[PDB]
Amino acid sequence: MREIVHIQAGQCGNQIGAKFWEVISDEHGIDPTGSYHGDSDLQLERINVYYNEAAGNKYVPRAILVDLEPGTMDSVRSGPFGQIFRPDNFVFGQSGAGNNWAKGHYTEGAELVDSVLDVVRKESESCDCLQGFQLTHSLGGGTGSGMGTLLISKIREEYPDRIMNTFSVVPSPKVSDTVVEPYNATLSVHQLVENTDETYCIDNEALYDICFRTLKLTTPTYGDLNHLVSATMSGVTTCLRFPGQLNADLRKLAVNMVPFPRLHFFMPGFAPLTSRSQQYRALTVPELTQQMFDAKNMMAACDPRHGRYLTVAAVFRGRMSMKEVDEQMLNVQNKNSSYFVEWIPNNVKTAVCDIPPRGLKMSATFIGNSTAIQELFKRISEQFTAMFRRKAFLHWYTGEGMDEMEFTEAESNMNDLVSEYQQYQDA
Amino acid sequence: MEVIELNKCTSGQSFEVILKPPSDPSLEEIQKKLEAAEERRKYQEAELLKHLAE
Amino acid sequence: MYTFVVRDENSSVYAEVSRLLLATGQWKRLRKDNPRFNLMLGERNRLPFGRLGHEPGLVQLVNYYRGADKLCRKASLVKLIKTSPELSESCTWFPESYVIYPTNTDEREVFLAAYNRRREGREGNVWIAKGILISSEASELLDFIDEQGQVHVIQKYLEKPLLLEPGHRKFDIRSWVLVDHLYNIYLYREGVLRTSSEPYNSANFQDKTCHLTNHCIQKEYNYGRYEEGNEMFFEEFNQYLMDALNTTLENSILLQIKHIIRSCLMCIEPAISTKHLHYQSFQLFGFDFMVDEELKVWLIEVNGAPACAQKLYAELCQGIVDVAISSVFPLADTSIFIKLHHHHHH
Amino acid sequence: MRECISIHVGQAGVQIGNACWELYCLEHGIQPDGQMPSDKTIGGGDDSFNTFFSETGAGKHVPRAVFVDLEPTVIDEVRTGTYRQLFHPEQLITGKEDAANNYARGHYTIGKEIIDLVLDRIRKLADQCTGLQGFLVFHSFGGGTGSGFTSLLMERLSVDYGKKSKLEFSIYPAPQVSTAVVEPYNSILTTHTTLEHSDCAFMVDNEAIYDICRRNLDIERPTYTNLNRLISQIVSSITASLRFDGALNVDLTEFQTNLVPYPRIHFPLATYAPVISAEKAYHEQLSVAEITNACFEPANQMVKCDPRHGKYMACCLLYRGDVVPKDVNAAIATIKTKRSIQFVDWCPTGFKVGINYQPPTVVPGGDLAKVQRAVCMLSNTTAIAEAWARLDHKFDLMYAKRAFVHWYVGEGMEEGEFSEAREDMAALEKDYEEVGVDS
Ligand SMILES: CC[C@H](C)[C@@H]([C@@H](CC(=O)N1CCC[C@H]1[C@H](OC)[C@@H](C)C(=O)N[C@H](C)[C@@H](O)c1ccccc1)OC)N(C)C(=O)[C@@H](NC(=O)[C@@H](NC)C(C)C)C(C)C
Ligand SMILES: Nc1nc2c(ncn2[C@@H]2O[C@H](COP(=O)(O)OP(=O)(O)OP(=O)(O)O)[C@@H](O)[C@H]2O)c(=O)[nH]1
Ligand SMILES: Nc1ncnc2c1ncn2[C@@H]1O[C@H](COP(=O)(O)OP(=O)(O)CP(=O)(O)O)[C@@H](O)[C@H]1O
Ligand SMILES: Nc1nc2c(ncn2[C@@H]2O[C@H](COP(=O)(O)OP(=O)(O)O)[C@@H](O)[C@H]2O)c(=O)[nH]1
Ligand SMILES: [Ca+2]
Ligand SMILES: [Ca+2]
Ligand SMILES: [Mg+2]
Ligand SMILES: [Mg+2]
């Protein structure tokens, strides 16, 4: 009844997107049928944020599934939770995007985008008071990247006073060997800087390293990477889905998290880190607090000690002492005060939700707007320039109508972003 | 020191004790207020829509 | 880790406390405007006491007592003594004194009431102003007060001071007093006589290298003749009092000093104590004393931000840490002060 | 008899209102359905309690209240809570989406689409009043609605009810429970725009109340419910003289007269005693001297500050319970000799005392113990400006970098409205310093 519209785009976007629906549907007591079989009414009080009700007391994700090839969507459909999704919200083409941002944004994607907007519009029109949109996608491929950014631009045209939120998956050569990813991602970041209000930087570099170094998985799969993504996504959406004081809608989060409109790229973090394998000792509140702020628990590969936190939100789940939570939270700030900008007083805000995630007695999710996120953008930028200075691989893009100029503006805008962060790390 | 104004009733009582003596915007201006803000929002939204059209 | 900030760069004493704290490796200094501190060593003017004790999770302590200026400004001090019944007009350890304004409240009239019973007892009638001048002649000072612009004090000048021999010299005593957060009053066992180097001349009041005993006003005019820096310490002065006068420092002067210090600070305790407050205060004071030839002690002035004497920085600054600070913020894992307390029953 | 309309704005305003009306009903022995067995004039009256309740032929006592929130959640808890029948649906007004912790969204953007509706609902209550005195307005400084809508509402009540008194109960922001990092911005903005429109404002700092709850009720982590029950006892205390027979502060005009000689300096400090845990097994009941003396302990104040280091301009003591004048005067005599209490030169040093013999009522199952006698001091001391200083400093820190400003400009407000509101506060902190210090 403050409604969110979810869209998932491309391979990655739909993979993490389906995972998201599996996990929260379980947290809200909804089964693949769409039938509620839970034992508490916290589960239902705010269900209409993410689900429409249907006849037979049926709950149906407010979810649009977009791709330019079918592969992944067929997989969603005949998977476990596939029956839960509204069939006419599956919107797909046949040709695919060949990891090519230009195909996704300008050629192949344009052919399909109006159909997606028809479905978005139908879902918007039956919302008591729509708050905005959330999108899941990668930035290194073509559909999620180029088409997903194209959609963002068009949604903002029709709904310019609604909030736009992305879970954007940032590429890393530790996970993909596709050579043009830095292109597709620099081009996407340009879009996100201008047209989203909140972006969760979910860095495939960090997810891989957490899987290998910490979880001792010698051969990480996308399944292992995604388990981390779904846990983070459950965590960062908890204040929107359950009854609560703080960051209970997208706009309020935005207001608390974004001091400057361009600096809306968040480092998420999760504790305790787990692989898909039972965790038998519950964490103490001090442990959650120390872990959630640990660099090794960050889903964006940045060293938080290399920058300064503009704003933080922390979300603690499970039955625990609020007193201990406040003491520990306060203790992180007072022991490391120098990493928290002094010109934004009381910049850390903390929420506690009694329902834990499945699997855990206790958990914490960290959302940080820190200036160290530049390291991520510099990395993408270094990879971009290495190719761009020899105009390499550009024919794949100019062949779809693009000019070099457009690459140059994008590189520039992301380098401006980086230096604005630097600006505030030294203030 | 000096008690005064002693008032008593069924509910209670009151008095004073003294230790020491001494030694607007119009309806119009508002409706305007609101309307200039809204015009500025409209301009900002229009500029964005102009930009998105480009 | 405890934390602290520094907001008075020119403080001789607190410079030294910054060093000693860091060197514990259990205290971390922050930028002066970072509010997430356990301890502030504050500025001297408009210290923002209203922003203290509103940081959850932080016991906060400051090195000044709000309200203390009332003891430490000459106009206020004089005022405080006449008005407070615990001190009163009686008060036998403070020179008769009056608050006088320029004419650009005032008790100029009531000053003369006494000036012309010393001209109508023809006895000693020398006074002193608050840039400072002594005179026998009232209107040569009043015409000096209005010609300077600030509110000033007129005080009876003590014509019969104790005089150190060899030298026929004059001195004041400075005692360093520390009041902690519990309002324990701690007298540092080392005081110092800030001496003159030039024989006291009672017939001539302009040549003021002999009437004013200030560490600066001596230097910048026989500095160093009888002892370093015109500073006699207590072992020697005690020794001299024994030799020359057959008495002790403790008995002749120091009981009086302890008495004056307690009386001063117990007077204002209710206006400045932090015992139930949301931040706690401590503070170092420097009390300045005069002794007459009769071995009678007189309070000159109280200093809100005193400097120590070079020899004694190391020990005093350590004591401040031990009692004023580590009392509030303990560590893991011989006392240089004497505690002023006295509970007589009547 | 002259009627008073209570207006509760935003989550904090509303939840505090709930708590107050719950207490008022118990105090006046009015039941959840609105029936009052002790009232014998059925369908009417001009008793003192009727200043705050209207009556129906069915025998129903209904608050002279209007609740307004820009989202519905919180007002829906009233609509279906235990006092649902007390209120006429038309007194509970809600929007679809809230002001998102933004003064401008609440003032300019959403305020415009709802102001007229509320004014009309307030007009419906005013029309049942033979002699309306004016309004009590309850809101937070830090919420978007509480700050932004309220100031708009206050500018309009000045226009449509010019001769009428306006009092505030204002929640001043505290990080231990605040929900937004821009609360300092909102607090200053609403204070600026609201200042000329409010005759007397009682600020409560959530910090103060939170700690009273920790320290005196042994509550490990205070909730709004804990906080509000406490706040509501202070409020009831302040308003008792308007709902009960007496001769002190019998009308809204009198608070201004007794507590506010300099109009802009209209922020009296409340101090309340005794606050005693209901779980406490053995409690020695506290004397008149003891609870009066507690009125001068910063730990018992609604705002932490130190009244020793400013001056007084007025001081009322409001007692409930077994208290007689003679005991009050002895208490005050002793206290004057012990404590630092300096009035300004142009004001008598003295107290106005109000005694209601009925001891404080408490919510059954609440945290507060029943007590034999209690007191609330209202003192207009320049020391409360410490709170202004704190708020202003935080505002300066953020605004120097324009942090978050774009959210406000985004809603139609102009960057200049920030610096103009800060100038007003700058001058406010100056008025307080003139009045309260010498050298
Ligand atoms: C780190 C790079 C990705 C993550 C891994 C992973 C791919 C994966 O997980 N794949 C390839 C689609 C199928 C999926 C897994 O099979 C292994 C299934 C069980 C799974 O995790 N399925 C999940 C539950 C499913 O939801 C899913 C998710 C995404 C896509 C499809 C299906 O295989 C180990 N890959 C390419 C590799 O490890 C490869 N190695 C390389 O690319 C190296 N460079 C040569 C890497 C380290 C940069 C191959 C030699 C195998
Ligand atoms: N004492 C008290 N403080 C509250 C309560 N609710 C919110 N607050 C405080 O008020 C401020 C939050 O403002 P709210 O009143 O929630 O804001 P709102 O008026 O609902 O405005 P929007 O939600 O922005 O539309 C913070 O300082 C909260 O701690 C309450 O019930 N009691
Ligand atoms: N009533 C008095 N009788 C005799 N000598 C006096 C006196 N008042 C002041 N003096 C002399 O003047 C000297 C300095 O005066 P005073 O102490 O008032 O000024 P000051 O504040 O600049 C230095 P400090 O802050 O260290 O005390 C004293 O050491 C003392 O010898
Ligand atoms: N974390 C995660 N990353 C993925 C997944 N699938 C693809 N990626 C990454 O996403 C990028 C390729 O984008 P993809 O979504 O496959 O292309 P699209 O279908 O054209 O949007 C590369 O950086 C891949 O490593 C996934 O399931 N999980
Ligand atoms: Ca085609
Ligand atoms: Ca009646
Ligand atoms: Mg692919
Ligand atoms: Mg609200």
**Which CATH number goes with the domain that contains D80?**
3.40.50.1440
| Neighbouring subunits of C (3+ Cβ pairs under 8 A) | A, D
Distance from the C207 Cα atom to the nearest Cα atom in chain D, whole angstroms: 33
How many Å apart are CA A333 and CA A331, to the nearest integer?
5
With contacts defined as CB-CB under 8 Å, which chain A residues touch D176?
326
Residues followed by a break in chain C (C to N exceeding 2.5 Å) are 104, 130, 221, 333
Strand-by-strand arrangement of the C97-100 sheet: C97-100, C152-156, C127-129, C134-135
DSSP per position, A83-137: GGS-GGGEEE-SS--TT-HHHHHHSHHHHHHHHHHHHHHHHHHT-SS--EEEEEE
Instruction: Please give the angle made by the CA atoms of D232, D238 and D243, to the nearest 5 degrees.
Output: 95
Return the biggest CA–CA distance within chain B: 82
Q: Could you give the 3-state DSSP secondary structure of residue A352?
A: strand
Give me ligand 7 centre to Cα A71, in Å.
Answer: 9
Token pair belonging to C35: 């509010």
How many Å apart are CA A260 and CA A310, to the nearest integer?
10
Domain boundary among D336, D368, D383: D383
Please tell me what DSSP assigns to residue C53: T
Taking CA–CA distances from D108, the nearest residue in chain B reads B34
Give me ligand 6 centre to Cα D19, in Å.
Answer: 23
Residues D23 and D115 in one domain: yes
φ, ψ for residue B2, nearest 5 deg: -90, 105
Give me ligand 7 centre to Cα A98, in Å.
Answer: 7
CB D8 within 8 A of CB D138: yes
Radius of gyration of chain C (CA): 22
* Spatial CA neighbour of D1 closest among D132, D194, D174: D132
- Taking the C-alpha atoms of D305, D306, D310 and D314 in order, what is their torsion angle to the nearest 10 degrees? 80
- Taking the C-alpha atoms of D194, D196, D197 and D201 in order, what is their torsion angle to the nearest 10 degrees? 70
**Three-state SS across D91-155?**
HEEECCCCCCCCHHHHHHHHHHHHHHHHHHHHHHHHCCCCCCCEEEEEEECCCHHHHHHHHHHHH
Element (DSSP H or E) covering residue A290: helix A285-292
Q: Is A333 on the interface with C (CB under 8 A)?
A: yes
Residues D240 and D284 in one domain: no
Token pair belonging to C341: 């307390």
Q: Give the number of other CB atoms < 10 A from CB of residue C299.
A: 21
φ, ψ for residue A324, nearest 5 deg: -70, -40
Residue D272 marked as a ligand binder: no
Amino acid at residue number A139: L
All CATH 3.40.50.1440 domain ranges in chain A, comma separated? 1-259
Return the biggest CA–CA distance within chain A: 61
* Spatial CA neighbour of C28 closest among A337, A286, A289: A337
Q: Give the number of other CB atoms < 10 A from CB of residue D100.
A: 28
Is residue B25 left, alpha or beta, with left meaning phi > 0 and alpha meaning psi from -120 to 50? beta
Token pair belonging to D424: 């007003």
With contacts defined as CB-CB under 8 Å, which chain C residues touch A338?
30-31, 34
Q: Could you give the 3-state DSSP secondary structure of residue A232?
A: helix
Token pair belonging to B54: 């480009």
Q: Is D175 on the interface with A (CB under 8 A)?
A: yes
Give me ligand 6 centre to Cα D55, in Å.
Answer: 7
Give me ligand 7 centre to Cα A163, in Å.
Answer: 28
Distance from the B37 Cα atom to the nearest Cα atom in chain D, whole angstroms: 4
Alpha carbon distance, N-terminus to C-terminus of chain A? 41
Are the Cβ atoms of C33 and A338 closer than 8 angstroms? no
State the CATH number of the domain containing residue C127: 3.30.1490.20
Please tell me what DSSP assigns to residue C281: E
How many Å apart are CA A57 and CA A44, to the nearest integer?
12
CB A97 within 8 A of CB A128: no
Residue whose pair of structure tokens reads 């504790």 in the numeric block: A271
Amino acid at residue number D228: N
Are the Cβ atoms of D350 and B25 closer than 8 angstroms? no
φ, ψ for residue D374, nearest 5 deg: -140, 165
Q: Which atom of ligand 2 is nearest to the CA of D10?
A: 19
Pocket of ligand 2, beta carbon within 6 A:
D 10-12, 15-16, 70, 98-101, 106, 140, 142-146, 171, 173, 177-179, 183, 206, 224, 227-228, 231
Instruction: Write the residue with the smallest CA distance to atom 10 of ligand 2.
Output: D140
> How many residues does the structure list for chain C?
346
Element (DSSP H or E) covering residue D66: strand D65-69
> How many residues does the structure list for chain B?
54
Ligand 1 site, residue A15, Cβ cutoff 6 A: yes
Radius of gyration of chain D (CA): 21
Q: Is C49 on the interface with D (CB under 8 A)?
A: yes
Q: How far is CA A228 from CA A16, A139, A190, A213, in A?
A: 10, 18, 26, 14
CB D225 within 8 A of CB D18: no
Chain-centroid distance of CA C248 in Å reads 23
According to CATH, the superfamily of the domain at A260-372 is Tubulin/FtsZ, C-terminal domain (3.30.1330.20)
Beta carbons within 8 Å of C107's beta carbon, 6+ residues apart: C98, C99, C100
With contacts defined as CB-CB under 8 Å, which chain A residues touch C60?
none
Concerning whether D254 is annotated as a catalytic residue, the answer is yes
* The CATH number fitting domain A1-259, selected from 3.40.50.880, 3.40.50.150, 3.40.50.1440, 3.40.50.2300: 3.40.50.1440
* Spatial CA neighbour of C2 closest among B5, A129, A335: A335
Residue to mutate, C125, C171, C172, C289, ligand 3, most ligand atoms under 8 Å from C-beta = C172
Strand locations in chain C, DSSP E? 2-6, 27-29, 39-41, 61-62, 97-100, 127-129, 134-135, 152-156, 171-179, 185-188, 192-195, 231-232, 280-281, 283-291, 297-303, 337-340
Q: Which atom of ligand 1 is nearest to the CA of A72?
A: 31
- Based on the structure, what is the number of domains in chain C? 3
Beta carbons within 8 Å of D119's beta carbon, 6+ residues apart: D156, D160
φ, ψ for residue A59, nearest 5 deg: -105, 125
- Taking the C-alpha atoms of A14, A16, A19 and A21 in order, what is their torsion angle to the nearest 10 degrees? -70
Q: Could you give the 3-state DSSP secondary structure of residue A3?
A: coil
Q: Which atom of ligand 2 is nearest to the CA of D9?
A: 19
Residues D156 and D290 in one domain: no
Residues D240 and D341 in one domain: no
Residue to mutate, A138, A176, A222, ligand 1, most ligand atoms under 8 Å from C-beta = A222
Q: Which atom of ligand 1 is nearest to the CA of A12?
A: 29
φ, ψ for residue A341, nearest 5 deg: -50, 130
Token pair belonging to B42: 């409209």
CB D275 within 8 A of CB D230: yes
Helix axes A10-27, A71-78, angle to 10 degrees: 20
Give me ligand 1 centre to Cα A167, in Å.
Answer: 21
Distance from the B32 Cα atom to the nearest Cα atom in chain A, whole angstroms: 23
How many Å apart are CA D131 and CA D127, to the nearest integer?
10
* Spatial CA neighbour of C171 closest among C128, C218, C127: C218
Half-sphere exposure of A306 (CA within 13 A, CB side): 11
Helix axes A322-335, A285-292, angle to 10 degrees: 40
All CATH 1.10.287.600 domain ranges in chain A, comma separated? 373-427
Token pair belonging to C20: 């000693």
What is the sign of the dihedral through the CA atoms of D378, D380, D382 and D386?
Answer: positive
Chain-centroid distance of CA D192 in Å reads 18
Ligand 1 site, residue A220, Cβ cutoff 6 A: yes
Fold assignment, A373-427: Helix Hairpins (1.10.287)
Element (DSSP H or E) covering residue B15: strand B12-20
Q: Are strands C171-179 and C192-195 parallel, antiparallel or unpaired?
A: antiparallel
DSSP per position, D288-342: HHHHHHGGG-GGGBSS---GGGS-EEEEEEEEEES--HHHHHHHHHHHHHHS---
How many Å apart are CA A179 and CA D190, to the nearest integer?
55
φ, ψ for residue A358, nearest 5 deg: -60, 130
Among the partner residues D336, D352, D414, nearest to B19 by beta-carbon distance = D336
Q: Tell me, in Å, the resolution of the deposited structure.
A: 2.5
Q: Give the number of other CB atoms < 10 A from CB of residue B7.
A: 13
Residues followed by a break in chain B (C to N exceeding 2.5 Å) are 23
CB A308 within 8 A of CB A371: yes
What is the sign of the dihedral through the CA atoms of A182, A184, A187 and A192?
Answer: negative
DSSP per position, A292-319: HTSGGGBSS---GGGS-EEEEEEEEEES
State the CATH number of the domain containing residue C343: 3.30.470.20
DSSP per position, A183-231: HHHHHHHHHHHHH-SEEEEEEHHHHHHIIIIIS--SS--HHHHHHHHHH
How many Å apart are CA A354 and CA A317, to the nearest integer?
6
Residue A278 marked as a ligand binder: no
Domain boundary among D346, D368, D383: D383
| Neighbouring subunits of D (3+ Cβ pairs under 8 A) | A, B, C
Residues C27 and C174 in one domain: no
State the CATH number of the domain containing residue C25: 3.40.50.11480
Are the Cβ atoms of B19 and D112 closer than 8 angstroms? no
CB D370 within 8 A of CB B48: no
Taking CA–CA distances from C38, the nearest residue in chain A reads A334
What is the domain range of residue D439?
384-439
State the CATH number of the domain containing residue D410: 1.10.287.600
DSSP per position, D367-422: SBPP-SEEEEEEEEEGGGHHHHHHHHHHHHHHHTTTTTHHHHHTTT--HHHHHHHH
Distance from the A131 Cα atom to the nearest Cα atom in chain D, whole angstroms: 9
Residues D171 and D237 in one domain: yes
- Based on the structure, what is the number of domains in chain D? 3
Are the Cβ atoms of B11 and D325 closer than 8 angstroms? no
Residues D415 and D324 in one domain: no
How many Å apart are CA B7 and CA D247, to the nearest integer?
6
* Spatial CA neighbour of D150 closest among D9, D4, D6: D9
Distance from the D207 Cα atom to the nearest Cα atom in chain B, whole angstroms: 32
Token pair belonging to A199: 């972006």
Token pair belonging to C114: 């006494």
**Experimental technique for the deposited model:** X-ray
Residues C9 and C57 in one domain: yes
How many Å apart are CA D103 and CA D120, to the nearest integer?
23
Residue D252 marked as a ligand binder: yes
Helix axes D415-436, D385-399, angle to 10 degrees: 150
Q: Give the number of other CB atoms < 10 A from CB of residue C103.
A: 8
Residues C79 and C134 in one domain: no
Helix axes B27-53, D150-160, angle to 10 degrees: 140
Please tell me what DSSP assigns to residue D261: S
How many Å apart are CA A350 and CA D178, to the nearest integer?
10
Are the Cβ atoms of D96 and A129 closer than 8 angstroms? yes
What is the domain range of residue C132?
96-159
Is residue D179 left, alpha or beta, with left meaning phi > 0 and alpha meaning psi from -120 to 50? alpha
How many Å apart are CA D116 and CA D93, to the nearest integer?
12
Instruction: Please give the angle made by the CA atoms of C10, C15 and C19, to the nearest 5 degrees.
Output: 160
Residues D166 and D306 in one domain: no
Element (DSSP H or E) covering residue A166: strand A163-170
Are the Cβ atoms of D397 and A128 closer than 8 angstroms? no
* Spatial CA neighbour of A122 closest among A7, A9, A237: A7
Instruction: Write the residue with the smallest CA distance to atom 31 of ligand 2.
Output: D12
Beta carbons within 8 Å of C206's beta carbon, 6+ residues apart: none
Token pair belonging to D176: 């231990």
Q: Could you give the 3-state DSSP secondary structure of residue A360?
A: coil
Active-site residue, from D3, D168, D207, D254: D254
| Neighbouring subunits of A (3+ Cβ pairs under 8 A) | B, C, D
CB A293 within 8 A of CB A366: yes
Token pair belonging to D251: 């009308």
Residues C168 and C187 in one domain: yes
Q: Is D96 on the interface with A (CB under 8 A)?
A: yes
Residue whose pair of structure tokens reads 């640990």 in the numeric block: A294
Ligand 6 ion: residues within 5 Å (CB)? D 39, 41, 45
Are the Cβ atoms of C276 and D305 closer than 8 angstroms? no
Could you tell me which residues are beta bridge partners of residue A5? A133
How many Å apart are CA D397 and CA A427, to the nearest integer?
11
Residue A408 marked as a ligand binder: no
* Spatial CA neighbour of A29 closest among A358, A409, A362: A358
How many Å apart are CA A79 and CA A72, to the nearest integer?
10
Residues C105 and C12 in one domain: no
Instruction: Write the residue with the smallest CA distance to atom 4 of ligand 2.
Output: D12
